[PDB]
Design a protein around this ligand. Structure first.
Ligand SMILES: Nc1ncnc2c1ncn2[C@@H]1O[C@H](COP(=O)(O)O)[C@@H](O)[C@H]1O
Ligand SMILES: [Cl-]
Length: 213
């Protein structure tokens, strides 16, 4: 596992890993209690590095395949960022992944946080929602149809961006991010880091760091 500052100009110190939940989230007893109740033992390597970076308000690229704990890498700090529609948006390439993310979300949710999983409905989004987990296709069609307000989103995750590219979802994603506000925090995940994904990434992130398993 490597970590770097990809900002132009002066490089910033890399926050120290937080190898215990307590070290990342001691400030947030309700999130800790939620973790304790689930009964997992320790942060995964990428969690231990991703968390302190996101908590400092720095945009992050995580390059990592499934099984490494990448979901909680971006979900936990998103919960903290939340405490006017949803404030958090997670874009996933497929229904299966959206469902996977939504399942982790509701397993670890506390302080009456509400999430919705949206894929290929409007009524639940018309009531209060804090977190949207969505495929780009269905979410784009919803904004066009005036069904969803994205203007309160300040925490955005783009999950599996290489898959997003293979699937040619760039036009839909670009259009969704337009309704999202520019002063936002952004995390991006990807299983790979070729030049096309690097270019895409920088079209989403400002002054980002990277964690690369
Ligand atoms: N710190 C952890 N300890 C044990 N399991 C975890 C941890 N973090 C995430 N997981 C689980 O590992 C699986 C793979 O997660 P991901 O790589 O995010 O798809 C998911 O089912 C998670 O709920
Ligand atoms: Cl390193």
């Amino acid at each position: 596992m490597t970590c770097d500052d990809l900002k132009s100009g002066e490089k910033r110190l890399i926050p120290k890993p937080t190898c215990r939940f307590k070290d990342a989230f001691q400030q947030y007893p309700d999130l800790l209690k939620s973790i304790i109740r689930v009964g997992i033992l320790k942060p995964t390597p990428i969690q231990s590095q991703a968390w302190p970076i996101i908590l400092q308000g720095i945009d992050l690229i995580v390059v990592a395949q499934t099984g490494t704990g990448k979901t909680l890498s971006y979900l936990m700090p998103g919960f903290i960022h939340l405490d006017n529609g949803p404030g958090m948006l997670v874009l996933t390439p497929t229904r299966e992944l959206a469902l996977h993310v939504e399942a982790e979300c509701s397993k670890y949710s506390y302080k009456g946080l509400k999430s919705i999983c949206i894929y290929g409905q409007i009524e639940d989004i018309s009531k209060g929602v804090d977190i949207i987990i969505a495929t780009p296709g269905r979410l784009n069609d919803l904004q066009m149809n005036n069904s969803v307000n994205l203007r309160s989103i300040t925490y955005l995750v783009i999950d599996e961006a290489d898959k997003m590219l293979d699937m040619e979802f760039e036009p839909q994603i670009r259009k969704i991010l337009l309704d999202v506000r520019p002063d936002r925090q952004t995390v991006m995940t990807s299983a790979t880091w070729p030049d096309t994904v690097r270019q895409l990434a920088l079209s989403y992130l400002k002054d980002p760091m990277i964690v690369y398993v």
